[PDB]
Each structure stands twice: as C-alpha cells, then as structure tokens.
Design a protein around this ligand. Structure first.
Ligand code: CG7
Ligand code: AMP
Ligand code: AMP
Lengths: 442, 184, 299
C-alpha cells in the first residue's frame, strides 16, 4: 500500500547503475508486467550541464524501433526526476553469461554477434554511435536474444564533423579513443564489437593488463593472441575488425561479406536482404506517403489502396538498389564507350592549404587576409574560426568554417568547410569563390 | 501529477509531513539507503518537513523557508512544465545559461600557450578524385563518400594562373562532387 | 498504350541522379583550350558555365563548341589556330551566339516527361539539373541515362502493343538525307558536316560501299587528348586509329527487328544510335535515342 509507484508500476530492486542515472525493476500493480525504469535526477543533469545530451538520447530512443535495441515505452517527467520506462529483459548481462559458461560455442557466439551487429548497423544508419559497446551493455532476454542498452555515452554524427570525446572502458576503446584523437565514429563501434566477438569465443579480453600505461601500449600496438581452438576464418575477421589503422579497419559491409559471418544468418536482420522489405517497416517510405496522402497506414497493411502506395515506393527502391552500377562507381569486361583517353601529367588533389611555419604565425596571416577581403569572423577556438562574407550580387551571406590541423612534426594544414542552413546564385559556387579569395591572399 | 520526496540522509525511521497532508506524519519506505514517497500533487507552492529518528530535520539540498515563529520547512514549486519531458528539459536548459560577428583578431592565449592544433584525422586524406573508377562504368560516377569528408575543400596545385577547387556536397540521399576551374 | 508516358509523369528527375557523381564547372573567363583539356583529364563531355560577374549559370561547354571552334578557325597544319590558343569561354560565346540563348535547365523535382520534352523541343543532348533552393547544379541529364532508367522498370508495367511492332511498321528515325563520311574524308570536312547537319555521328564508308567505322562528336575530343587538333587534313580513319584495337564494329539494327530489341541493344551498348539496315545488310538510315524517346514519351 505504502510502496513507491510511478504510473501503475511498483518499483523494486535496483538492476544496476548506468553512465547516467539508476535502473530499477518495475512491476505492474494489476497485471505484474515487468519494465526497467531508468531514473535521471534533474539537478544532477543541471550540475553536469548534460541537458542537451539527455534531450538527444530521449529523441533517438523514441525514434528507435529495433528487435536488438532496448525499447523505450514512455518518459514520465516529475519536478525532481525523469523516469524512463523501458523494455525489461530477464537474462541480464552478456558478460555474466560469458563468465558462467567460460566461453560461448561458435554457433551461439555467431548468432549473438549477428544480432549485436544488426543493432549497431541500425544506429549508424540513423547517424548514432553507441561508443560504450561491451558485454556488460549487451543484455539477454528469455529466448537468448541480444539487446544493446546504455545510450548515455552515445552521440550523433553529422556531415563534415568529427567526434573526440573519450568514451567507454579502456578494454573496449579503440586506439584513437585512448590517444585522445578525432575520429569519424563508426570504426570505433566496430573495434568494440571485435573485442565482444573475441570475449564471446575466448572468454577473455584480447588486450588486458593491471598497469594502465601498459594496457594503452598493448591496444595501440594492436597485437593480440589468437587461440588454437579458433579457425582461420574467425581469426581473419577479428584481425580486420581490430586494425589499429581506422582506414584499414573493417566496415559493417566488410563483416557482412565475410564467409564466417554469412553462415546461418537470418535474412531479416540487415537492409537489402531477401526478408527485410517484407517484414521490416521503413520510416522514410511512410514519411514519403504522408505528404501525398500524415495519418496511420498500419490498419491497411495488417489489400487496401493506401497499403499499395507504401509497397510501390519499396518496390521502386529495390529496382534502383539492384542496379548498383547505375547509381555508384565500381572499385578498380569491355570499357564504357565514353571513357576518355589520357592527356598528352596525372595531377593529385589535396585538402586545403599546407604550411611548414609556426601555428601562431599561420593564424596571424589568416586574420590579416580576412580583414583585407572584408570578412566577419567568430573565434570559437584558437585554431577554429566561423567566417562570413556578404555576396554583393545576390545580397546573401556566405558562411564557412576554418580549422588548423597538425600533419606531422613540421607540417600543418588549414581546412575549409562550407556551412549550409542562394536562389539567385549557387551555394557551392559561393563557397569555392570565398575559398579562392582567401587562398590567393595567403 | 507525481511528485518525488526522497531522503538522502541516514536513519532507521523517517516520516514526511507537509501542507498537503495537514502536517501529519507519513511513513516513508526504505530501499538500501533511500527513504521515498511518490504523491499526486496539484500546481503551486508546497511546504514540507522530515521526522528522522524522533527528531525534526530538513533536506539542505532543497530550498529553505522559515516561518514567522522559526520553523524550517522545505519549499517545492510544482509547475506545468514539470509534467511534460520536453517542456521540463527546456526549463533545465535555460537555467544553465543563467555573440556577434566581428573583424577583430583573437589573442594567442589567456596565459601563454604552446598548445598545438589538433592532429589531422586520416579520413580527410581519402581523396575521392585521386581514386580510380573502374573502366566498365560511366566516367561521371564516383563511390559513396564518407559523411565526414562532406563540405570539405580539396584543391589542385595552381598551374598557368588557373586554380581548381572541389568539394563533396549532399542533396537529399545523393552526393555531388563539384569541380570549379577559375583563373587566379 | 501510353504506359511509358504515365511513368515519366510520375517519376521526378531526382530518381535518375546517381548516388555519387562528379560535376565539372568552368568560369566563363577561363581560356577555351584549358577547358577542353579539363574535360579530358576529368573524363567528362559537357560542363555547366558559371559567370562569376552575373553570379549565374549561363550555359554549357560541350565537344560541339570544340568542333565549331576548329572548323571556324582552322587554316593549316603549318599555322596554329590562334583563337583556340588565346580565346576565353566568354569571348568565344560572344562570336558563337552573335541568338542570345537562355540557360535550358530542369529542376530535380520536375518529372522525366518535362526533361524529355525539353531535350526534344530544344534539340539538345545534355540538360543540367539545377536545385532551385540552393542554386547548385547537381547532374547533367542525357537521353542515355533516361532510356537506361526505363529499361530497369520495363518488367514493372505491362508492355504496350507498339513494343512488339517492327521498326519498319512504326517508322522511327531518319531514312532520307543521311549525312555520311568516306574512309579518306579529312577531319576538317567531317567537322563541317557536323556544323551544317547538326547530327551527333557520321558513318564511315569504304570505296566498295561497306560501313567500316563510325565518327561520333565524342571521337573529336581525341584531337585534344592526343594534341593532334592542329592537323585536320588527316583522314577520319587516321583519327579513329587510336581505338582500332578493342573495337567490335559498327553497332547496327534491322528494319524487321522489334522496338523492344532496339531499346535493349542501345541500353546494353551505352551508345547514342544504331545504323538501320534492310533484310540485306543495306544501309536504310539511322535510329537514335532522341527518335526512341520521342516515340515512347512525346507521342
Ligand atoms: C546513483 C543515483 C542515481 C539517481 C539518483 O537520483 C534518484 N535516485 C532515486 N531513487 C528513487 C527511488 C525509487 C524507489 C525506491 C524504492 C523504495 C522502496 C522499495 C523499492 C525501491 O526501489 C527508492 C528510491 C527515486 Cl523515486 C528517485 C530517485 N532519484 C540518485 C543516485 C544516488 O544514489 O546518488
Ligand atoms: N548521320 C546522320 N545522318 C542523318 N540523320 C541523322 C544522323 N545521325 C542522326 N540523325 C538524325 O538526326 C536527329 C538527331 O540526331 P542525334 O544527334 O543522333 O540525336 C535524329 O532524328 C536522327 O534520326
Ligand atoms: N552505332 C555505333 N557503333 C559502334 N560504335 C559507336 C556507335 N555509336 C557510337 N559509337 C561510339 O561510342 C562512343 C560514344 O559516342 P555516342 O554514342 O555519340 O555517345 C564514341 O566513341 C563512338 O565512336
């Protein structure tokens, strides 16, 4: 009677403590339906200035609809706390399963890895990076299905921008994360997944040490032991996933193509697969119908005229995706008739403009060059500027971001990046023309 | 609307009394360390106290209000924004907060700094125009670019007074790598 | 009937644009010689023109501009073509247009019907797709791209009665006043036939009468790549010698062959036209993508 109740759920034992907040089991007062309630303290969020991160985290978890990602049912707001009512899974952490059995058998390990990678790929396609992938953050249900959960250290990846924030346990963190360097995002999640696959199959970590500076040297070295009980196929997949070089590191497409990963793989886990279009609802396809005819089209699908409209886009999308050579260029058969012979040679392209002088001297030359060309800038960092120039013909402002980078011990680089938010002119021409003025002056 | 009353402090027996229950002692259930109660309360100011181990006390982390006689009661304002998540997050964001474009150069450091610029990410060195197409396909076609290389400027070395600039830009779910030849 | 016409109206231009493609743009103040060399180094045929003073896209620079410059200004193999060496894009356009032609373009939101109608009316091959919101040129739309797109959706709709009909029955293409070139025809003469007749290719005929090769407007750009544009006295055979190795022959079609097979042969070959022939391998005329798309969509 005097129990703590949020909604119609009675709060029980603490399931654990996440990156942000506390998680408690919830049991429905009338039915006994079980949920997991993540309690976020409003003052703790304010004290840490994590208001923006919490906002983006809720937005994504509400949008997310994947069988291998923990569902968020509702968020109950109170004057002191935020109560995130989520899907409950009885099997607990994957970490505890690995410890109980010593090591997971190849068949079950692959099945679980295929489910984890399916969830990771869903996040990446929705421009979200987990950045805290470990078996502790991978939960199991009653039917032994994997579900990724703590999106506290997650972030959204935008066009042209990089991520730096040092997130996750050192044992699962990529060499670039440890080094405190800028990274794209997805390659960091693939490293963590490689460590999970090693831990599933071996029941041990590929890089482990009591002394932290030695552990960091081990990860940066990328040298790990491959046990004799693992076949060469899985070994190559692990070696491609755990590459020190992020450019040489495996992509989700590379893993999907691997002979070991392909075995007994369900045809509904990944997009473009034979059962994905027939069993998985496409958000972008439903949104395209909304502008033509906003209401829910679920009743017609679960044959009505409204349902055919959804499937027409899905069919047309498949035809365009099947003709791979028509929309994208192949990796380097008769040559294309329009292939042009070589001139007469072979000039190489480069990012922005390079300088071997001191970084303070480079920046000083930038401020002078801008002032002569009547530019207006904002100093967000000592090496990061937000420049603006009004176009005289179109009467519109042209915006670009300047960033100074370190190439080597003596070399530096000035990066130019356009900012998009011109009817008479052209946006791309405005960026090129603003860059040209600054390049010629410098 | 649900309102949380949590006792972070220690104790064996904790009670809650306020303006909402005519200052009567309500027993709080304990977990491992917390003593909590979730009550449905209307919008407005609410005064409350805590009765721990036979002694009157208050939460120091919550706002303090002293009456005409001298009794200390915690005050909590139940607002309309506190019921909806996105409205509550909007109030929390503006609470943390509590410029223009210029032609003035920034100083080297607040205090003298030898701090180096960030190390160039290797992804930007993957030049789309330096890569070979494969002969079978249309010469206009290019591979799918990394989202991270988008909007970045790429250039050729100035030859015979003409400069060449390129960049990869997005249009909906498609990418265009425009090249511009203009005299310097 | 009229199935393909309804298909064109429903599909926007955006659906044709590749996922990733390159676009070469020239400033109108750029020297015309550097511009044609840039088309070669970047492997493109056409390029939109940006007038930095007007802050607008004013036109397109194609291989037709190169053909026109050469035929107008070539004098001898002994003397250099001064205008080709010193003319800027803007100065060339002033003498070429004398006819102040506005920029013929299409929006990515406009239907394929509007793009095909624009390509036919204006008698053009390359139509720039420009976003009205950003003002950016996204893609150069052609007859090849449009026809190849339809080929992917042929199974998606019922095939009309005209697709099963013979080319002789439908009468699609030109079968009179066919502009041709001899095996020994000098390049300069072949360029004159291009300017006068406004056709994209000239079939090459030997002394016996047989069609050995085909000289297209595209082949003219090899004069810039090999830097052999200064000697236009050489034969068409000598100008096509660079591609003698790895050349199957002149892609032809028969008058008895169905419209479906002509479309499939053209799409697979990624070529603009086929030379039609009768039951005997006798040249009866030509059938290009402009003829095909006019019959399929416009009518
Ligand atoms: C680690 C942490 C995370 C969040 C946090 O903020 C909150 N913790 C909370 N705990 C509770 C809470 C919920 C249920 C119960 C409870 C009471 C009786 C039986 C079972 C229960 O779960 C105890 C405390 C509530 Cl209602 C709000 C909270 N807000 C405080 C802490 C913290 O202990 O510093
Ligand atoms: N060599 C040629 N001689 C005569 N007519 C042609 C030739 N090439 C193309 N045509 C016709 O000219 C029109 C436009 O040609 P095209 O430039 O190939 O699109 C079409 O109606 C063709 O049938
Ligand atoms: N009917 C044809 N038979 C053989 N080659 C062709 C034919 N039409 C065009 N070509 C070649 O294909 C290339 C592309 O030209 P076009 O078809 O005009 O876009 C040129 O190098 C032509 O020489």
């Amino acid at each position: 009677d005097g129990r703590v109740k949020i909604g119609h759920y009675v709060l029980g034992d603490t399931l654990g403590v996440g990156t942000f907040g506390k998680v408690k089991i919830g049991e429905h007062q009338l039915t006994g339906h079980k949920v997991a309630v993540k309690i976020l303290n409003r003052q703790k969020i304010r004290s840490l200035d994590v208001v923006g991160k919490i906002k983006r985290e809720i937005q994504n978890l509400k949008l997310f609809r994947h069988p291998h990602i923990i569902k968020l049912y509702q968020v109950i707001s109170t004057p002191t706390d935020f109560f995130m009512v989520m899907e409950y899974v009885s099997g607990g952490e994957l970490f505890d399963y690995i410890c109980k059995h010593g090591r997971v058998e190849e068949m079950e390990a692959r099945r679980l890895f295929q489910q984890i990678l399916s969830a990771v790929d869903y996040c990446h396609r929705h421009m979200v990076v987990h950045r805290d992938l470990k078996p502790e953050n991978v939960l199991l249900d009653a039917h032994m299905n994997a579900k990724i959960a703590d999106f506290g250290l997650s972030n959204m990846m935008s066009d042209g921008e990089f991520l730096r924030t040092s997130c996750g346990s050192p044992n699962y963190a990529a060499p670039e994360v440890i080094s405190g360097r800028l990274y794209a995002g997805p390659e960091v999640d693939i490293w963590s997944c490689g460590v999970i696959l090693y831990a599933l199959l071996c029941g041990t970590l590929p890089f482990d040490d009591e002394h932290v500076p030695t552990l960091f040297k081990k990860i940066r070295g990328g040298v790990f032991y491959i046990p004799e009980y693992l076949n060469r196929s899985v070994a190559t997949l692990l070696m491609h996933m755990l590459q020190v070089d992020p450019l040489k590191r495996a992509t989700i497409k590379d893993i999907r193509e691997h002979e070991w990963f392909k075995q007994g793989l369900p045809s509904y886990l990944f997009p473009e697969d034979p059962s994905y279009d027939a069993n998985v609802i496409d958000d972008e396809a439903v949104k395209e119908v909304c502008e033509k005819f906003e209401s829910e089209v679920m009743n017609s699908l679960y044959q009505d005229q409204l349902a055919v409209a959804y499937h027409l886009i899905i069919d047309n999308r498949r035809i365009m995706n099947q003709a791979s050579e028509f929309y994208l260029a192949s990796s380097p058969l008769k040559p294309h008739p329009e292939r042009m012979p070589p001139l007469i040679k072979k000039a190489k392209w480069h990012l922005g403009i390079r300088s071997q002088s001191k970084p303070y001297d480079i920046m000083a030359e930038v401020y002078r060059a801008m002032k002569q060309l009547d530019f207006e800038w904002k100093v967000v960092n000592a090496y990061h500027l937000r420049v603006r120039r009004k176009n005289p013909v179109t009467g519109n402002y042209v915006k670009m971001s300047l960033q100074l980078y370190l190439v080597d011990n003596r070399s530096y680089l000035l990066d130019f990046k356009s900012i998009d938010d011109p009817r008479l002119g052209s946006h791309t021409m405005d960026f090129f023309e603003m860059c040209a003025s600054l390049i010629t002056t410098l | 609307r649900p309102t949380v009353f949590r006792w972070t402090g220690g104790g064996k027996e904790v009670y809650l009394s306020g303006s909402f229950n005519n200052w009567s002692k309500l027993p709080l259930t304990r977990s491992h360390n917390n003593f909590v109660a979730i009550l449905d309360l209307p919008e407005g100011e609410h005064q409350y106290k805590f009765f721990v181990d036979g002694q009157w006390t208050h939460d120091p982390s919550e706002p303090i209000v002293t009456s005409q006689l001298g009794t200390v009661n915690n005050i909590i304002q139940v607002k309309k924004t506190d019921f909806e998540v996105f409205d509550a997050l909007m109030v929390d964001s503006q609470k943390c907060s509590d410029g223009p474009y210029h032609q003035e150069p920034y100083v080297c450091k607040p205090e003298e700094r030898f701090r180096a610029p960030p190390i160039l990410p290797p992804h930007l060195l993957q030049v789309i125009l330096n890569k070979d197409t494969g002969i079978s396909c249309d010469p206009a076609l290019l591979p799918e670019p990394n989202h991270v290389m988008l909007n970045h400027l790429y250039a050729l070395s100035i030859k015979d007074g003409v400069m060449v600039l390129s960049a990869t830009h997005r249009y909906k779910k498609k990418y265009v790598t425009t090249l511009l030849y203009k005299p310097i | 009937n009229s199935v393909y016409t309804s298909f064109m109206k429903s599909h926007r231009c955006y659906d044709l644009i590749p996922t990733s493609s390159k676009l070469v743009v020239f400033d109108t103040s750029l020297q015309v010689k550097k511009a044609f060399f840039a088309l070669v180094t970047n492997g493109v045929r056409a390029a939109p023109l940006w007038d930095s003073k007007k802050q607008s896209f004013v036109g397109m620079l194609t291989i037709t501009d190169f053909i026109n410059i050469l035929h107008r200004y070539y004098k001898s193999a002994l003397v250099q073509i001064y205008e080709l060496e010193e003319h800027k894009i803007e100065t060339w356009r002033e003498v070429y247009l004398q006819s102040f032609k506005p920029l013929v373009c299409i929006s990515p939101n406009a239907s394929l019907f509007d793009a095909v109608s624009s390509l036919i009316r204006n008698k053009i091959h390359r139509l720039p797709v420009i976003d009205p919101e950003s003002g950016n040129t996204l893609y150069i739309l052609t007859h090849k791209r449009i026809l190849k797109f339809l080929k992917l959706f042929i199974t998606e709709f019922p095939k009309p009665e005209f697709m099963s009909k013979s080319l002789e029955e439908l009468q699609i293409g030109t079968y009179a006043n066919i502009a041709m070139v001899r095996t020994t025809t000098p390049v300069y003469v072949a360029l004159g036939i291009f300017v006068q007749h406004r056709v994209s290719a000239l079939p090459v005929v030997d002394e016996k009468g047989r069609v050995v090769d085909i000289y297209s407007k595209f082949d003219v750009i090899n004069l810039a790549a090999e830097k052999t544009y200064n000697n236009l006295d050489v034969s068409v055979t000598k100008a096509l010698q660079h591609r003698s190795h790895y050349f199957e022959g002149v892609l032809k079609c028969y008058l008895h062959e169905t419209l479906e097979t002509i479309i499939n042969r053209l799409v697979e070959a990624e070529v603009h036209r086929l030379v039609v022939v009768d039951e005997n391998d006798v040249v009866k005329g030509i059938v290009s993508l402009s003829d095909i798309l006019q019959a399929l969509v416009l009518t």
